[PDB]
Design a protein around this ligand. Structure first.
Ligand code: ZN
Ligand code: ZN
Ligand code: ZN
Ligand code: ZN
Lengths: 206, 206, 206, 206
């Protein structure tokens, strides 16, 4: 659990996120909880040119490490860590299906039993605020109080979990749920859902 | 036809299922008929970390082999083997188009002549029941009486055949049929179908 | 222009057709004009297991070479060669967008200037008849009189051209046109088209 | 900044454009500003067979280099360089989502904050004119006056930027925006947009 090992894992998560089709260009960013702050990828460096030296340490006070590039969306990663003590890794991306649902400003309802992976019977959609603002941070903190993932209106997705592998796995499951929702919404609105009783049973089993 | 060779084949089927885009994360599972029970993949191990030692033998009585991980959906694989004596391999996944049709709770009708590959003029959709329950097992057993594949409402797909290669091949053909159905349903409902007379001719030819 | 070189080229076309996402499983088949008949791939052998020895010579009289596997759709390849003397290679597949348009039983109209690549202002859709029948052959022969590609209702696509590379290239362009048509049809029906005057200009330029 | 290095970069951009799924077959073409004209890829050579010797120099007067293949869409690349002095690289392709929006003859409105990457609150759609004509060149020049990318009605996309990497990056972001727009248009028309006030804030931040 030293810095260089975590940096390697962050870079591998970025590569896998791109291979799964969730990250295109420079939209995504990943972080892990570390010491009193987090290690995060910088803005604007494509995944394939990322090296261990690019990873930035931002402390608990928001001070950025000397000589590193900026990460313009760092504030909502820190908001996730403060809102969910149990989160140790945060994945952000603008995956296409998640993002399309966020444009409609809809939560994803219980259309499939795997919705329980994010903690409840829905994937919420937090209201729009400019990237990098305190306002956006507060909406994210409130959406993650009782959920491990949330859509960001007109923006994309945030998913958090106990480690990088589970956070990426969750981000991918939410993109699958978003694709299922949009595909079925085009045919019938509203889409059939499982009852709260049924999701309660699934949550216990998980 | 020894255990290690079949284990290898199960792992290769998992890899191919992922390459074809039918399996994402840990949703899919594959089994083969073996001795008095079956060999199956365990729950929660991503395809890329699967080894021969992970494959679990579950006997005819439902006893799990010592020291292996659980497979929470094993009951509907055993239900398939008991319902269809001719089935020697079972593929389960949550492929996106198959799963979207299962959310609509519709059977796939005879929109293409390749629907006859599953045995008749449709791909049924079995009613929802919690994963791992006897109730879900009974719905699957009834749906597979006269069909080699079935959708599972709010869940995914089950396909069975005489060997692993044909079972995967069938699972992929059903995902293609589901994509054809959703794509055309978005434009016109209902979608034009081939008559029962025409499917009877195709079934004889196959 | 010896048999072994053409067999190699047929196998490479099969591989590329799969890489482009146009061919899945065992649905596609490819042929080239050769001596008094054609060389074609057999039914049921997946692309990855195809060898030079699998390629079948079918003469002008329809006699199949000794000891080879059958090709159940050979008749419409021969119908293409007889209908279009200029065709030297024929590609058949069940590409998803082409096939979805064929289920709707619609021709693809001039929604994009590249429609002229198939010879006119449309991609026709030939009426359904059972695969392998003389009836299906006659519908294909008539559809290809003035076009180099045609959809097959409830079935898929046939594209022909002067060599294997151009035939595959055309098949891919028709799949792109079909995807453009279905994507726009879901939003507005009918879809805006270029006038016959404009397609005439493009045809001259090509 | 010698010719051979730029030729290599053009070929690598072509390969990456194909890997990202933006270019299929021979539809796309790329250029860079060079001396008094530009270096561009020729018409009809598939990306995989492109060599450094294929790259064509077209001067400021429109004279083509001796012994090279033609590039039938060269005129709108030159129109981009003359209209936008700051552009040093131009990417053209017929990416499917961009092209479908161009068939509808719609601009892409501010459905996502990344629309500001092209310079304003929209991606315009320039009116149809035959490829290779002065008329098409004039429509492109006018559309790029205040935007770095534009759709071409019934045709495709043009994107320009300060170097090849940023031009490709922009082309991909516009294809993502087009996919978001079509996916949401199928569910609700019109699609919710960010206000001009909000895009003004984002533009300043960028
Ligand atoms: Zn973002
Ligand atoms: Zn399942
Ligand atoms: Zn066929
Ligand atoms: Zn073009």
């Amino acid at each position: 659990m030293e810095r260089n090992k975590l940096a390697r894992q962050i870079i591998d998560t970025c590569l896998e996120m791109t291979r799964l089709g969730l990250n295109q260009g420079t939209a995504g960013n990943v972080s892990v909880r570390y010491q009193d702050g987090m290690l995060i990828t910088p803005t604007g460096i494509p995944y394939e040119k990322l090296t261990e030296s690019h990873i930035v340490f931002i402390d608990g006070n928001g001070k950025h490490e000397e000589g590193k590039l900026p990460q313009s969306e760092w504030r909502f990663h820190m908001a996730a860590y403060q809102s969910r003590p149990d989160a140790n890794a945060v994945v952000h991306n603008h995956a296409v299906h998640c993002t399309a649902v966020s444009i409609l400003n809809r939560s994803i309802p219980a259309i499939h039993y795997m919705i329980a992976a994010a903690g409840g019977n829905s994937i919420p959609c937090a209201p729009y605020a400019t990237f990098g603002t305190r306002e956006l941070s507060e909406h994210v903190a409130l959406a993650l109080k009782n959920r491990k993932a949330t859509l960001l209106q007109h923006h994309g997705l945030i998913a958090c979990e106990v480690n990088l592998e589970k956070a990426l796995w969750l981000a991918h499951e939410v993109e699958v749920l978003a694709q299922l929702y949009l595909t079925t919404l085009a045919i019938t609105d509203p889409v059939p859902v499982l009852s709260d009783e049924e999701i309660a049973v699934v949550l216990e089993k998980f």
